């Protein structure tokens, strides 16, 4: 068994971490006080869930997680929340003033004060690991802490843990829920600084999660609580192979091997189905083919884009519930004939399938209904570059007038780092077009 | 995240006392400092503007400054006068005689150090100080001259804090003396350099609203301050209350100010109401949205169609459909997208609070950084030049040690501010 | 009001659509780079489809179908027909075509074409006989195609022609065929002795600059051409030609529907296409090419552009038939 | 469709399906750029206090 440490940065990272660890505990049968009655190896063990949970002598199961926010009010809700006993106080880190939606304030000014403290608390968790494989980082592109302080943390983790993999769960900015106007700035700046330090990054456009909640959950004005419960389901499907027995994606290295042929192009598109409302009185349960066919509708993707006008480099299907291989191959046969699925010429056209018999766990009182089978498709398609195009366009409109740049330069940043980061994004967009067109 | 409030001069203390009356009622505090409210949203961010004293009392983090005891005595005898910490009353005796030079260089210089002592005493007790907000007029002597002297010295001692101001612009429609364009031009020069956010509250707009809209034939300073305290309550809503937008003074400046000198906002409010007269039909969300963007509801006498909106911030207060708010706010942007700059994507952010102001069930407050605000400064630069081209009334200032050159420099810097706003109206 | 933007000033068709839209009093035009639009009359090259359908509170629609260039480029059209089972290699209405890069598969047909001693005239885009002459022209990407040596010749004149049909595909993927076509004729009599002189072969309006002899602008419309078929050949345009045209148009568009349909996308698409047909000596229709940004005829601009607003734009944005619907 | 590497257990199973074959900066450099930005902050604050001193 090899351990994974999760790190949650900023509001979006911490609140999504609350959603995931709430879900993990329900899936593994762990109670808010940390007690796991099904665990018969008291005070230790190397089961698959021990990848994410440590064990104390009293029987508590402590997440291998650290929460960090430059401002306390979000993590303060964790310290006094339903799962307050789950975490040790030393793995919840807060400052006093946040980055004020300013990347340079979170990376340089305020980030420098607290970076050495976080790395020590991270070192505390790592010393309890007989074999650390790497980290899972949860953060937002638009936040000053989520963008600024994460990029600084990712730089330092490559130094102190040069042999460890690092995976990102990132929140692509969407104006329907965004709080800042400078989020395109923070997004480009943090992606450039972090691009070489991340081995696999799962982007989640809030616009896509917003419309899915409106369309498939019958919520007129979805809140962060709605979004984060749906996001945690996707994140749970992605990490389920690390926490459960299986043979597909059993370590963080296997995520890069199965999904990322080119180091720079490491942004797999995630598609999830079915999303069914709990308020729906009558529901006809969907079959394997129906939910596999839903993985190729853009309306079910974590990022809105058109994979028909791109090329695949890899494709995983992660089933949860009543699924057997025979029904999967029958479904893939039909879909290949009716849809545009083009792979790059230097890659085999195929799917890596993983099935978990335990159906998706839904939190009680949540918006999601209980289904009999679900699937999360992870596909490295070049069509996800459309999100970089949108993001770089908004960056170009503001930076042409140097609007808001004075806020970043006033924090010690240099105007050249803007165009330096934008040049890297221009190269990233060009790599996608080479591979996909 | 505490905010230190300062009110300087007659106008500064009169709108400042009214501001504390309005928000104390919104947070459920009585004139004696005792909280007798019903909801706990009133106390969750109460420390932003209030200090907690002995016996569960709430003392406003406010400092009252004047060179006369006249107005500040009226505040202490006022309805909420006893809520203010008595040591925060700092006043002289000679006054400033509507003279920027007396407030900034001579009379105010004697008193500015004792004010900063009270400022320092309030800042040291702060867990984490966001910054300061000042209420003052630009046409008088104390709030205009000494106010900008305080801002300059506060920025020297707290260079990494936000300086926010509520600045009342003089108008010949509501005029005390003829030297008001002199004092305003000298003060705007200081505001362009030493503040992060300034709310331009034009007395001309407040008069036109009282006259043209509220149907008041002869408005008073009490009628004008009603609109001010309602606007001041609305713009500070997201700082005093919790919601999806939990904001501080710095985030507001970061998102509203794309260029450091262009930080003068047009406040707006809907529905426009007069004192002692309550209308009984609550406005629909389409009506709140329509009126808050109407020029007739702007607190700065500028035609927003003569410029373009750089950034816009909006607050809706009351029980309403947040979906209907999103649709109407997007409806304004999509039907009038020529008046929003295209080089700042998604420059309109909306926030909702459930607590409505007193006497209203639904309200909408508007904060606009429009290039049309140059019309305000153009108006003052014309009234300035009309007198300065003949050096009229300048002896009141040269008698206090000022040179004609300082007036020329202030006149020039304001004209530069106007042409700078014009730069982004054409782009 | 509805809002739209214009990113192609060189478009004669949508220039008239701008005037028609503005004349309703319910459509306001914005600047090129304004993102808060309902409709985009976009550019022909590098249209930013990725930025469409991401503006909250705005239903966005564009006058082009992303991916439709597979059908509107001569190189892509040949590859699509040869590889798609829906059309297949044995497609009876597409002439033999081979993509040549400036070969071995083409030389076999030409070698058997010499072996059969039948017509071995091939066009590449320019017309040549034998074989190797055409290749040197390509080197000094092109497609070679079998030149139809026995075309239907109008009388009087002994003239060659091509048929242009304007097809509109709306956001629901309804296929609409404009009832009014046009015959772009050759004013020079057809000479099969030499192809170096190509004023009688290339039926393009620009090649013709004998021009204007038989009908105005070398344009014969359906009213007069249908009467000619009755008088000369004892048939109608509907039976002898128009059935095959409606079959070809339907076959091509239904083939690429799964790849270009915007049925469940975050934005919507329509597009006007220009199908060019070649009728041979036995009243058989052949598809020459499909055009993605076609111009109209002056007589038909007012009626066609009015129909584009009615069927493609007003169907999504309603205000306060000249088309034949090809069913599928 | 070739189904390969089929692995089964109690929790579930996994396999692969094929349809067609093919056709860092050091800690020293981080500390330097973090202090280069603080130097630029100190310089801008010094120019402010010098201006306010005049
Ligand atoms: N899905 C999701 N998105 C969030 C959440 N919280 C914030 N966001 C998004 O993240 C962006 C802002 O980032 P934040 O996490 O709030 O900012 P931060 O990391 O705390 O950084 P600072 O506040 O500037 O110190 C906006 O686009 C929000 O829409 C959340 O809980 N869930
Ligand atoms: N296989 C073929 N057999 C006989 N004639 C042909 C032919 N291909 C093309 N032609 C003739 O050559 C003319 C021009 O060919 P083509 O249509 O490929 O060029 P083009 O793309 O410039 C016209 P447009 O773009 O307007 O459709 C046609 O109008 C037709 O008269
Ligand atoms: N809106 C408003 N404006 C005022 C008030 N009192 C004075 N003013 C304006 O402020 C200017 C005079 O400033 P004042 O505060 O009296 O000067 P100071 O006391 O010496 O600082 C004039 O232009 C007045 O129109 C008030 O109570 N409300
Ligand atoms: C142009 O885009 C903007 C504009 C303004 C803000 C933000 C983004 N985001 C913030 O966090 C602060 N902020 C705000 N502050 C405050 Cl006191 N009231 C409001 C009301 C709406 O917005 C507010
Ligand atoms: Ca155990
Ligand atoms: Mg935050
Ligand atoms: Mg006075
Ligand atoms: Mg052509």
Short mmCIF file of N, CA and C and ligand atoms in Angstrom, two decimals, chain A residues 11 69 71 98, chain B residues 251, ligand 6:
data_model
loop_
_atom_site.label_atom_id
_atom_site.label_comp_id
_atom_site.label_asym_id
_atom_site.label_seq_id
_atom_site.Cartn_x
_atom_site.Cartn_y
_atom_site.Cartn_z
N UNK A 11 -10.80 28.89 -0.88
CA UNK A 11 -12.20 28.58 -0.60
C UNK A 11 -12.67 27.39 -1.43
N UNK A 69 -5.77 27.98 3.85
CA UNK A 69 -6.41 29.16 3.29
C UNK A 69 -5.79 30.37 3.97
N UNK A 71 -7.01 32.94 4.79
CA UNK A 71 -8.04 33.62 5.54
C UNK A 71 -8.87 32.56 6.25
N UNK A 98 -6.53 37.55 3.24
CA UNK A 98 -6.44 36.72 2.05
C UNK A 98 -5.73 37.47 0.93
N UNK B 251 -10.76 43.94 -1.80
CA UNK B 251 -11.36 43.25 -2.94
C UNK B 251 -12.21 44.20 -3.77
MG1 LIG E 6 -10.96 33.30 -0.32
#
